[PDB]
Design a protein around this nucleic acid. Structure first.
Ligand SMILES: [Mg+2]
Ligand SMILES: [Mg+2]
Ligand SMILES: [Mg+2]
Ligand SMILES: [Mg+2]
Ligand SMILES: [Mg+2]
Ligand SMILES: [Mg+2]
Ligand SMILES: [Mg+2]
Ligand SMILES: [Mg+2]
Ligand SMILES: [Mg+2]
Ligand SMILES: [Mg+2]
Ligand SMILES: [Mg+2]
Ligand SMILES: [Mg+2]
Ligand SMILES: [Mg+2]
Ligand SMILES: [Mg+2]
Ligand SMILES: [Mg+2]
Ligand SMILES: [Mg+2]
Ligand SMILES: [Mg+2]
Ligand SMILES: [Mg+2]
Ligand SMILES: [Mg+2]
Ligand SMILES: [Mg+2]
Ligand SMILES: [Mg+2]
Ligand SMILES: [Mg+2]
Ligand SMILES: [Mg+2]
Ligand SMILES: [Mg+2]
Ligand SMILES: [Mg+2]
Ligand SMILES: [Mg+2]
Ligand SMILES: [Mg+2]
Ligand SMILES: [Mg+2]
Ligand SMILES: [Mg+2]
Ligand SMILES: [Mg+2]
Ligand SMILES: [Mg+2]
Ligand SMILES: [Mg+2]
Ligand SMILES: [Mg+2]
Ligand SMILES: [Mg+2]
Ligand SMILES: [Mg+2]
Ligand SMILES: [Mg+2]
Ligand SMILES: [Mg+2]
Ligand SMILES: [Mg+2]
Ligand SMILES: [Mg+2]
Ligand SMILES: [Mg+2]
Ligand SMILES: [Mg+2]
Ligand SMILES: [Mg+2]
Ligand SMILES: [Mg+2]
Ligand SMILES: [Mg+2]
Ligand SMILES: [Mg+2]
Ligand SMILES: [Mg+2]
Ligand SMILES: [Mg+2]
Ligand SMILES: [Mg+2]
Ligand SMILES: [Mg+2]
Ligand SMILES: [Mg+2]
Ligand SMILES: [Mg+2]
Ligand SMILES: [Mg+2]
Ligand SMILES: [Mg+2]
Ligand SMILES: [Mg+2]
Ligand SMILES: [Mg+2]
Ligand SMILES: [Mg+2]
Ligand SMILES: [Mg+2]
Ligand SMILES: [Mg+2]
Ligand SMILES: [Mg+2]
Ligand SMILES: [Mg+2]
Ligand SMILES: [Mg+2]
Ligand SMILES: [Mg+2]
Ligand SMILES: [Mg+2]
Ligand SMILES: [Mg+2]
Ligand SMILES: [Mg+2]
Ligand SMILES: [Mg+2]
Ligand SMILES: [Mg+2]
Ligand SMILES: [Mg+2]
Ligand SMILES: [Mg+2]
Ligand SMILES: [Mg+2]
Ligand SMILES: [Mg+2]
Ligand SMILES: [Mg+2]
Ligand SMILES: [Mg+2]
Ligand SMILES: [Mg+2]
Ligand SMILES: [Mg+2]
Ligand SMILES: [Mg+2]
Ligand SMILES: [Mg+2]
Ligand SMILES: [Mg+2]
Ligand SMILES: [Mg+2]
Ligand SMILES: [Mg+2]
Ligand SMILES: [Mg+2]
Ligand SMILES: [Mg+2]
Ligand SMILES: [Mg+2]
Ligand SMILES: [Mg+2]
Ligand SMILES: [Mg+2]
Ligand SMILES: [Mg+2]
Ligand SMILES: [Mg+2]
Ligand SMILES: [Mg+2]
Ligand SMILES: [Mg+2]
Ligand SMILES: [Mg+2]
Ligand SMILES: [Mg+2]
Ligand SMILES: [Mg+2]
Ligand SMILES: [Mg+2]
Ligand SMILES: [Mg+2]
Ligand SMILES: [Mg+2]
Ligand SMILES: [Mg+2]
Ligand SMILES: [Mg+2]
Ligand SMILES: [Mg+2]
Ligand SMILES: [Mg+2]
Ligand SMILES: [Mg+2]
Ligand SMILES: [Mg+2]
Ligand SMILES: [Mg+2]
Ligand SMILES: [Mg+2]
Ligand SMILES: [Mg+2]
Ligand SMILES: [Mg+2]
Ligand SMILES: [Mg+2]
Ligand SMILES: [Mg+2]
Ligand SMILES: [Mg+2]
Ligand SMILES: [Mg+2]
Ligand SMILES: [Mg+2]
Ligand SMILES: [Mg+2]
Ligand SMILES: [Mg+2]
Ligand SMILES: [Mg+2]
Ligand SMILES: [Mg+2]
Ligand SMILES: [Mg+2]
Ligand SMILES: [Mg+2]
Ligand SMILES: [Mg+2]
Ligand SMILES: [Mg+2]
Ligand SMILES: [Mg+2]
Ligand SMILES: [Mg+2]
Ligand SMILES: [Mg+2]
Ligand SMILES: [Mg+2]
Ligand SMILES: [Mg+2]
Ligand SMILES: [Mg+2]
Ligand SMILES: [Mg+2]
Ligand SMILES: [Mg+2]
Ligand SMILES: [Mg+2]
Ligand SMILES: [Mg+2]
Ligand SMILES: [Mg+2]
Ligand SMILES: [Mg+2]
Ligand SMILES: [Mg+2]
Ligand SMILES: [Mg+2]
Ligand SMILES: [Mg+2]
Ligand SMILES: [Mg+2]
Ligand SMILES: [Mg+2]
Ligand SMILES: [Mg+2]
Ligand SMILES: [Mg+2]
Ligand SMILES: [Mg+2]
Ligand SMILES: [Mg+2]
Ligand SMILES: [Mg+2]
Ligand SMILES: [Mg+2]
Ligand SMILES: [Mg+2]
Ligand SMILES: [Mg+2]
Ligand SMILES: [Mg+2]
Ligand SMILES: [Mg+2]
Ligand SMILES: [Mg+2]
Ligand SMILES: [Mg+2]
Ligand SMILES: [Mg+2]
Ligand SMILES: [Mg+2]
Ligand SMILES: [Mg+2]
Ligand SMILES: [Mg+2]
Ligand SMILES: [Mg+2]
Ligand SMILES: [Mg+2]
Ligand SMILES: [Mg+2]
Ligand SMILES: [Mg+2]
Ligand SMILES: [Mg+2]
Ligand SMILES: [Mg+2]
Ligand SMILES: [Mg+2]
Ligand SMILES: [Mg+2]
Ligand SMILES: [Mg+2]
Ligand SMILES: [Mg+2]
Ligand SMILES: [Mg+2]
Ligand SMILES: [Mg+2]
Ligand SMILES: [Mg+2]
Ligand SMILES: [Mg+2]
Ligand SMILES: [Mg+2]
Ligand SMILES: [Mg+2]
Ligand SMILES: [Mg+2]
Ligand SMILES: [Mg+2]
Ligand SMILES: [Mg+2]
Ligand SMILES: [Mg+2]
Ligand SMILES: [Mg+2]
Ligand SMILES: [Mg+2]
Ligand SMILES: [Mg+2]
Ligand SMILES: [Mg+2]
Ligand SMILES: [Mg+2]
Ligand SMILES: [Mg+2]
Ligand SMILES: [Mg+2]
Ligand SMILES: [Mg+2]
Ligand SMILES: [Mg+2]
Ligand SMILES: [Mg+2]
Ligand SMILES: [Mg+2]
Ligand SMILES: [Mg+2]
Ligand SMILES: [Mg+2]
Ligand SMILES: [Mg+2]
Ligand SMILES: [Mg+2]
Ligand SMILES: [Mg+2]
Ligand SMILES: [Mg+2]
Ligand SMILES: [Mg+2]
Ligand SMILES: [Mg+2]
Ligand SMILES: [Mg+2]
Ligand SMILES: [Mg+2]
Ligand SMILES: [Mg+2]
Ligand SMILES: [Mg+2]
Ligand SMILES: [Mg+2]
Ligand SMILES: [Mg+2]
Ligand SMILES: [Mg+2]
Ligand SMILES: [Mg+2]
Ligand SMILES: [Mg+2]
Ligand SMILES: [Mg+2]
Ligand SMILES: [Mg+2]
Ligand SMILES: [Mg+2]
Ligand SMILES: [Mg+2]
Ligand SMILES: [Mg+2]
Ligand SMILES: [Mg+2]
Ligand SMILES: [Mg+2]
Ligand SMILES: [Mg+2]
Ligand SMILES: [Mg+2]
Ligand SMILES: [Mg+2]
Ligand SMILES: [Mg+2]
Ligand SMILES: [Mg+2]
Ligand SMILES: [Mg+2]
Ligand SMILES: [Mg+2]
Ligand SMILES: [Mg+2]
Ligand SMILES: [Mg+2]
Ligand SMILES: [Mg+2]
Ligand SMILES: [Mg+2]
Ligand SMILES: [Mg+2]
Ligand SMILES: [Mg+2]
Ligand SMILES: [Mg+2]
Ligand SMILES: [Mg+2]
Ligand SMILES: [Mg+2]
Ligand SMILES: [Mg+2]
Ligand SMILES: [Mg+2]
Ligand SMILES: [Mg+2]
Ligand SMILES: [Mg+2]
Ligand SMILES: [Mg+2]
Ligand SMILES: [Mg+2]
Ligand SMILES: [Mg+2]
Ligand SMILES: [Mg+2]
Ligand SMILES: [Zn+2]
Lengths: 137, 204, 118, 122, 59, 74
RNA sequence: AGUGAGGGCGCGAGCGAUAACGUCCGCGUCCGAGCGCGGGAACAACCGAGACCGCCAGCUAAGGCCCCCAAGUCUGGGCU
RNA sequence: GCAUGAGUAACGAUAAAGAGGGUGAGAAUCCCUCUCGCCGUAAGCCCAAGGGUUCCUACGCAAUGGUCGUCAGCGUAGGG
RNA sequence: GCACCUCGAUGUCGGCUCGUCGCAUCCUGGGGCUGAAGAAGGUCCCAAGGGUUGGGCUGUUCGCCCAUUAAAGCGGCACGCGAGCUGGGUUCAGAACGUCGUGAGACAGUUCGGUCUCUAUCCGCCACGGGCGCAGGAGGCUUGAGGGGGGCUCUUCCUAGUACGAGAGGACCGGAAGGGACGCACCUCUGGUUUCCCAGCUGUCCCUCCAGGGGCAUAAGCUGGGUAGCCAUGUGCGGAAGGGAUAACCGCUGAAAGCAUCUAAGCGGGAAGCCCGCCCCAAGAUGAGGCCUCCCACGGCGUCAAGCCGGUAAGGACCCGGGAAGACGACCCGGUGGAUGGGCCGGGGGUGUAAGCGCCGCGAGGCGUUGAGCCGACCGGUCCCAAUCGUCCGAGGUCU
């Protein structure tokens, strides 16, 4: 009687694999299934990942971005079936796990504090250039 | 009437038709019948159910004999589902379909000795503006020389929770027979690891 | 309530309660065996265990960690050079607590001994 | 999560700028109002020669809130402010432009014009 | 607070009644396997210093 | 006529607090209202409040009848 | 010597509102001092009756006689 | 004089303790050691009032000490 | 009004808190009449189940006003509630205005200020144990007598722009959807806390000079975060359905009284109310109940006592390891034939790249090793440590 495994077992059927790895500070574009009255189209949503709170399948993440003046935060179930894909627009190196403090910074400061994560960018250009010789001949 | 014994294992949420749904999970199966209650013998109708297998090297002699007349290896819990008379020998979680509706009974979590604010949601006094030491206190509890006593059942501080609680009309989200699992939309009283009873609902 | 909370309070505030564990860990590692009230003995049981286990790792990092609580270079050496060897083939449980048959006169406190194993 | 006394940015061009909520119009005694709910409010400050003047008591509908709104798909959404659009008694927008995003709930709650006049629906 | 106070002296009957529960319990005790001296169970014997067969402390 | 009874405001000690000695008579057809918490006796005040209310509805109609006559002449 | 706060009830008057467990007089009565006994569920002053003491004897009063609760589920005759 | 409240309120600053060793009929409370904490324009040091042997030594615990006590501003003697 | 209890003390307004009862009903429910076309309204009858908002002004009760609402009911309970709180008012001593008095002083006139008492004995009330009983002793599982809880309501749409109406408007009946408040439970999500789970920072003192650390700055020095737990702002679910008997009220059949009459015999219908139904307590229900299973026969005396001694039986208690159980008791799990707590290990999760070294820069630092190092509780594993060894109690069944 593993209470835990029993739970993780139930979830397993609903788990995703396809979404790419990311960390706070990274800029990210979530293509999301929405409802326009009748139909269902994809809307993109793109900003800094200010937060990830892990809890296995129940893990989630918050994206912040400004639109037409007003700042907006959106909170996504990481294994939501409404996520069509997730794009890594840009990678940045944050010095902490929760980035709410940028709620109060000028887009100039936000820029100065969140430098581009060269290491993980390099690895990203390294990989994918890596996996390409078999997606060929 | 139909129902099963079980153990609350935990909560998560699943997805269904692109809506999230909170569920608590219950390990129900299986449950061997141990005794039936006839009207000829007992004056009412119900079935005793066994649940969770017991270390025989801990079962005593009166208990062992009741278990013999049944003809089933010992078990840790005996509980009756009233007015349920299972055609079969062992009650399985199979008795529920996704979509059905169930009443669940479990023991609520135990608050111990609880204030009148936690037990009964009294407002208590003001956190400022003059209050001499009555910030969480119950206020007045009566009138004056008439009646000159306190009502029976007056809401007062005392033990809270750790008690029988039944929550009605929970939807069966899903059942997983190969694990004896049960998914119910909503919340079920008591801690995980706790005993629960899942009856067919009484609401029409 | 208190449900599923782990760890004794021992009628001390945080800063004191911690010094208490250290000062008992110092004494225990120093003399090998001490006598204390039973509840202190049960908390200390796990606290000394973890430091000893760190010594079983022997590395500088481990030594610098254990220094934080034991603070004594001399004593720490004894732990690494003499106590940790004794336990290289034993997983946890480097300590044991036995209850005594005598209470304190002045306050009736039940006593117990805590000691390292062989 | 708006309630009486709460200030809100007006997200239209009626000429108001700040209104303070004085009543929420769900129910006999509803505690708070959220996105898609209608509030009665007083105009607390406004630009000259706009339609609405200060001290006007008006109806409005909440289009953005600092308190995050939950969604059936398990998502949630939150803004940096509390905004509303002034509307007439038929619940139609008294302005002609709305500013900033509005929450997709408006669609469902009914307010169709507001959603069109919006720059972005989130 | 307005200083609550006993309205009547407690009767000897009622006083002693309250103390119906005040009675002490004899210490529970067991014989040591070694020295057969009485002692409290689960404690190391104070008479011979043995517990669980081993000599734990020296008496 | 609607008459309201209630506790007076200010001096009186024990008695002023436990005694609805204040009067408010509201003359319904005109909405004209008087109040009187002058004396300790409730009907001493109802008497006064009935006296003033009288003079005030009379004086109010006299003035109406005045600027009718006074303006029909104009 | 004590008394010089009386009170209730019936009746006759004044005051009062042909109110008051109201107030003030007059005639009487009882409580006061008979908060001793029976009745009126309980109840100073209403009904019965003025307790020297004893009785495991008797008759009556008021009030009662179906059970609590002593004595008629009595006898005629009506009504509801 | 002795009860009741009652083995109840309280044990007088929330600066804080722990272990080892010793002494002793007896040790959470006395001594020694190590560790920890607190004050440091004091919670350290020196005058003046006032107090009048409380000072040092040895022996001692009935009472005094809000518990304990082998300890003490306590008791006895000696000295100063 | 009277002056009957209380002056060897019955604390006096409003507020707050907690209510509970009345029904002369404010709303919701059922009705009759209507100057009831419909929609609405008026008036009366039944009905106390539940409900009966938030603000501005004033000490205010009252009252006016704003914004809503199904409604914003009225009364009793020492105008309920100060050994429950407040103390704005009132009702001491200070001081002032107006005012009266030669004056001292005075004012149902006003103004500023003005000590509200740690310990509950009995009854009552909320919780929790101990004893005994329940004629053999047990381990389980139950029956529900009798109680308690709960009981609100709106809007939209379909029926249907239909019946009705000149039009404007606009239904009954039946069906659907979304709300407000309140209740119970829960922690998956959202959102808090999370006194040492991780990191950064200032000053100072210390270890060991550098590095690295430790104390103190709170009873966390500060800050940025934060698992489990406890939580609401978060999630689920609830009120019902239905059965029965009725209220006002509407009827059938029907005399007395050839006719008529809901009634005198007899029958039908009919409320958010009543009894059920739902949830919870529950056999001290001394009327102490029921079912399944287990233990056995007395070992000895005692006339009058269905008694006693005292080993055992089924079992139980003690002690110990613990526990989303808990003030203590109680309750639940486990005690080596064992995973119960501790350590160790793994998983989850938090923090966010340890120390050490190498490289770059005069340097503060930076880059790499590196998602590193550390790592409470959650989900599991592991006999390394600790639940050693033991002790006590408990039938042998009264009579027709
Ligand atoms: Mg669609
Ligand atoms: Mg987070
Ligand atoms: Mg941005
Ligand atoms: Mg710029
Ligand atoms: Mg990096
Ligand atoms: Mg990529
Ligand atoms: Mg069935
Ligand atoms: Mg089976
Ligand atoms: Mg079976
Ligand atoms: Mg078989
Ligand atoms: Mg079988
Ligand atoms: Mg069969
Ligand atoms: Mg079956
Ligand atoms: Mg608890
Ligand atoms: Mg309440
Ligand atoms: Mg109170
Ligand atoms: Mg009474
Ligand atoms: Mg009550
Ligand atoms: Mg209480
Ligand atoms: Mg409880
Ligand atoms: Mg409760
Ligand atoms: Mg329940
Ligand atoms: Mg199966
Ligand atoms: Mg649940
Ligand atoms: Mg049905
Ligand atoms: Mg508690
Ligand atoms: Mg607490
Ligand atoms: Mg303490
Ligand atoms: Mg303390
Ligand atoms: Mg303490
Ligand atoms: Mg030693
Ligand atoms: Mg460490
Ligand atoms: Mg060293
Ligand atoms: Mg070894
Ligand atoms: Mg409204
Ligand atoms: Mg609420
Ligand atoms: Mg949701
Ligand atoms: Mg309007
Ligand atoms: Mg939406
Ligand atoms: Mg548009
Ligand atoms: Mg006695
Ligand atoms: Mg006891
Ligand atoms: Mg032995
Ligand atoms: Mg002994
Ligand atoms: Mg009035
Ligand atoms: Mg006043
Ligand atoms: Mg009065
Ligand atoms: Mg009066
Ligand atoms: Mg009066
Ligand atoms: Mg006057
Ligand atoms: Mg004389
Ligand atoms: Mg004379
Ligand atoms: Mg005289
Ligand atoms: Mg007199
Ligand atoms: Mg006389
Ligand atoms: Mg007379
Ligand atoms: Mg009379
Ligand atoms: Mg008379
Ligand atoms: Mg007359
Ligand atoms: Mg008359
Ligand atoms: Mg008369
Ligand atoms: Mg009369
Ligand atoms: Mg009259
Ligand atoms: Mg009279
Ligand atoms: Mg008279
Ligand atoms: Mg006379
Ligand atoms: Mg008499
Ligand atoms: Mg006489
Ligand atoms: Mg008398
Ligand atoms: Mg008499
Ligand atoms: Mg009599
Ligand atoms: Mg009478
Ligand atoms: Mg009398
Ligand atoms: Mg009389
Ligand atoms: Mg009498
Ligand atoms: Mg008399
Ligand atoms: Mg008589
Ligand atoms: Mg007569
Ligand atoms: Mg005679
Ligand atoms: Mg006779
Ligand atoms: Mg006579
Ligand atoms: Mg007679
Ligand atoms: Mg009779
Ligand atoms: Mg009699
Ligand atoms: Mg008789
Ligand atoms: Mg005494
Ligand atoms: Mg005493
Ligand atoms: Mg004691
Ligand atoms: Mg004590
Ligand atoms: Mg106490
Ligand atoms: Mg005291
Ligand atoms: Mg004291
Ligand atoms: Mg105490
Ligand atoms: Mg020693
Ligand atoms: Mg000392
Ligand atoms: Mg130090
Ligand atoms: Mg020091
Ligand atoms: Mg200094
Ligand atoms: Mg100074
Ligand atoms: Mg100082
Ligand atoms: Mg000095
Ligand atoms: Mg001197
Ligand atoms: Mg002196
Ligand atoms: Mg002396
Ligand atoms: Mg001495
Ligand atoms: Mg001597
Ligand atoms: Mg002494
Ligand atoms: Mg002594
Ligand atoms: Mg003292
Ligand atoms: Mg001396
Ligand atoms: Mg001598
Ligand atoms: Mg000298
Ligand atoms: Mg008189
Ligand atoms: Mg009299
Ligand atoms: Mg007062
Ligand atoms: Mg209020
Ligand atoms: Mg009230
Ligand atoms: Mg009504
Ligand atoms: Mg009505
Ligand atoms: Mg009507
Ligand atoms: Mg009409
Ligand atoms: Mg009328
Ligand atoms: Mg009602
Ligand atoms: Mg009621
Ligand atoms: Mg009501
Ligand atoms: Mg209000
Ligand atoms: Mg107000
Ligand atoms: Mg005010
Ligand atoms: Mg007023
Ligand atoms: Mg008001
Ligand atoms: Mg209205
Ligand atoms: Mg209002
Ligand atoms: Mg009331
Ligand atoms: Mg009143
Ligand atoms: Mg009142
Ligand atoms: Mg009154
Ligand atoms: Mg009242
Ligand atoms: Mg009050
Ligand atoms: Mg008070
Ligand atoms: Mg008050
Ligand atoms: Mg007061
Ligand atoms: Mg004032
Ligand atoms: Mg005053
Ligand atoms: Mg006063
Ligand atoms: Mg003054
Ligand atoms: Mg004054
Ligand atoms: Mg004069
Ligand atoms: Mg003058
Ligand atoms: Mg006045
Ligand atoms: Mg005046
Ligand atoms: Mg002042
Ligand atoms: Mg004041
Ligand atoms: Mg004062
Ligand atoms: Mg004071
Ligand atoms: Mg009493
Ligand atoms: Mg309790
Ligand atoms: Mg308790
Ligand atoms: Mg209980
Ligand atoms: Mg009991
Ligand atoms: Mg006991
Ligand atoms: Mg018996
Ligand atoms: Mg049971
Ligand atoms: Mg029942
Ligand atoms: Mg019942
Ligand atoms: Mg009921
Ligand atoms: Mg009820
Ligand atoms: Mg009720
Ligand atoms: Mg509504
Ligand atoms: Mg319609
Ligand atoms: Mg439909
Ligand atoms: Mg239509
Ligand atoms: Mg039309
Ligand atoms: Mg139309
Ligand atoms: Mg037409
Ligand atoms: Mg349908
Ligand atoms: Mg309908
Ligand atoms: Mg519907
Ligand atoms: Mg939330
Ligand atoms: Mg959270
Ligand atoms: Mg520093
Ligand atoms: Mg530092
Ligand atoms: Mg350094
Ligand atoms: Mg140190
Ligand atoms: Mg320090
Ligand atoms: Mg710190
Ligand atoms: Mg952070
Ligand atoms: Mg935080
Ligand atoms: Mg922190
Ligand atoms: Mg936080
Ligand atoms: Mg947490
Ligand atoms: Mg809300
Ligand atoms: Mg809820
Ligand atoms: Mg609901
Ligand atoms: Mg009837
Ligand atoms: Mg006929
Ligand atoms: Mg006929
Ligand atoms: Mg007929
Ligand atoms: Mg009928
Ligand atoms: Mg009939
Ligand atoms: Mg019938
Ligand atoms: Mg019928
Ligand atoms: Mg009928
Ligand atoms: Mg019916
Ligand atoms: Mg009904
Ligand atoms: Mg009723
Ligand atoms: Mg109950
Ligand atoms: Mg039961
Ligand atoms: Mg039950
Ligand atoms: Mg039972
Ligand atoms: Mg019992
Ligand atoms: Mg039974
Ligand atoms: Mg025996
Ligand atoms: Mg325990
Ligand atoms: Mg235990
Ligand atoms: Mg406990
Ligand atoms: Mg373990
Ligand atoms: Mg194993
Ligand atoms: Mg771990
Ligand atoms: Mg891992
Ligand atoms: Mg991580
Ligand atoms: Mg570090
Ligand atoms: Mg490094
Ligand atoms: Mg990590
Ligand atoms: Mg990690
Ligand atoms: Mg820890
Ligand atoms: Mg072991
Ligand atoms: Mg062991
Ligand atoms: Mg054992
Ligand atoms: Mg024996
Ligand atoms: Mg016999
Ligand atoms: Zn021994």
């Amino acid at each position: 009687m593993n209470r835990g495994a029993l739970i993780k077992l139930v979830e397993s059927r609903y788990v995703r694999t396809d979404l790419p790895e990311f960390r706070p500070g990274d800029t990210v574009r979530v293509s999301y299934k929405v409802k326009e009255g009748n139909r269902t189209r994809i809307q993109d949503f793109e900003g800094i990942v200010i937060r990830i709170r892990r809890n296995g399948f129940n893990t989630t993440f918050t994206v912040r971005k400004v639109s037409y003046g007003v700042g907006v935060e959106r909170i996504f179930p990481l294994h939501s079936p409404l996520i069509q894909k997730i794009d890594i627009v840009q990678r940045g190196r944050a010095r902490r796990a929760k980035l709410y403090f940028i709620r109060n910074l000028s887009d100039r400061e936000i820029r100065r504090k969140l430098r581009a994560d060269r290491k993980r960018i390099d690895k990203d250009r390294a990989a994918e250039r890596a996996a390409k010789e078999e997606v060929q001949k | 009437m139909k129902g099963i014994l079980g153990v609350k294992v935990g909560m998560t949420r699943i997805f269904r038709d692109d809506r999230a749904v909170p569920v608590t999970v219950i390990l129900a199966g299986p449950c061997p019948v141990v005794q039936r209650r006839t009207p000829e013998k007992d004056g009412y109708t119900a079935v005793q159910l066994g649940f969770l297998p017991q270390n025989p090297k801990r079962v005593n002699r009166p208990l062992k004999g009741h278990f013999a007349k049944a003809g089933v290896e010992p078990v840790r819990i005996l509980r009756e589902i009233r007015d349920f008379n299972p055609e079969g020998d062992t009650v399985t979680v199979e008795i529920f379909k996704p979509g059905e509706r169930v009443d669940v009974t479990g023991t609520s979590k135990g608050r111990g000795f609880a204030g009148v604010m936690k037990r009964w949601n009294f407002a208590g006094g003001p956190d400022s503006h003059g209050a001499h030491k009555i910030h969480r206190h119950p206020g007045s509890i009566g009138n004056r020389k008439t009646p000159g006593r306190v009502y029976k059942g007056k809401k007062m501080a005392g033990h809270y929770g750790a008690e029988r609680v039944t929550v009605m009309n929970l939807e069966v989200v899903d059942v997983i027979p190969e694990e004896n699992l049960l998914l119910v939309k909503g919340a079920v009283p008591g801690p995980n690891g706790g005993l629960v009873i899942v009856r067919e609902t009484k609401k029409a | 309530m208190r449900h599923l909370k782990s760890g004794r309070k021992l009628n001390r505030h945080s800063s004191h309660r911690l010094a208490l564990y250290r000062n008992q860990a110092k004494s225990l590692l120093t003399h090998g065996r001490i006598t204390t009230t039973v509840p202190k003995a049960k908390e200390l049981r796990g606290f000394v265990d973890h430091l000893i286990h760190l010594a079983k790792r022997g590395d500088l990092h481990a030594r610098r960690l254990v220094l934080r609580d034991l603070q004594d270079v001399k004593l720490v050496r004894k732990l690494f050079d003499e106590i940790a060897p004794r336990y290289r083939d034993r997983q946890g449980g480097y300590t044991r607590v036995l209850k005594l048959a005598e209470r304190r006169r002045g306050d009736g406190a039940p006593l117990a001994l805590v000691e390292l194993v062989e | 999560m708006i309630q009486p006394q709460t200030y809100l940015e007006v997200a239209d061009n009626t000429g108001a700028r700040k209104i303070m909520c004085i009543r929420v119009l769900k129910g006999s005694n509803a505690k708070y109002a959220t996105v898609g709910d209608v509030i009665v409010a007083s105009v607390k400050e406004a630009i000259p020669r706009g339609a609405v003047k200060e001290g006007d008591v008006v109806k409005a509908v909440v289009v953005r809130t600092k308190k995050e709104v939950k969604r059936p798909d398990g998502s949630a959404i939150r803004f940096d402010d509390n905004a509303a659009v002034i509307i007439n008694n038929q619940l139609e927008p008294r302005g002609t432009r709305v500013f900033g995003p509005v929450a997709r709930e408006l669609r469902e709650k009914g307010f169709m014009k507001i959603v069109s006049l919006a720059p972005e629906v989130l | 607070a307005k200083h609550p106070v006993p309205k009547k002296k407690t009767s000897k009957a009622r006083r002693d009644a309250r103390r119906s529960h005040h009675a002490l319990t004899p210490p529970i005790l067991v014989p040591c396997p070694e020295c057969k001296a009485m002692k409290p169970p689960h404690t190391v014997c104070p008479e011979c210093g043995y517990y669980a067969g081993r000599k734990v402390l020296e008496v | 006529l609607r008459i309201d009874t209630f506790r007076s405001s200010g001096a009186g000690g024990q008695h002023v607090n436990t005694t609805d000695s204040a009067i408010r008579i509201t003359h319904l057809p005109t909405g004209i209202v008087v109040e009187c918490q002058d004396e300790r006796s409730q009907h001493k005040n109802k008497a006064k409040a009935l006296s003033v209310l009288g003079a005030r509805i009379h004086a109010a109609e006299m003035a109406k009848r005045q600027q009718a006559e006074a303006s029909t002449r104009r």
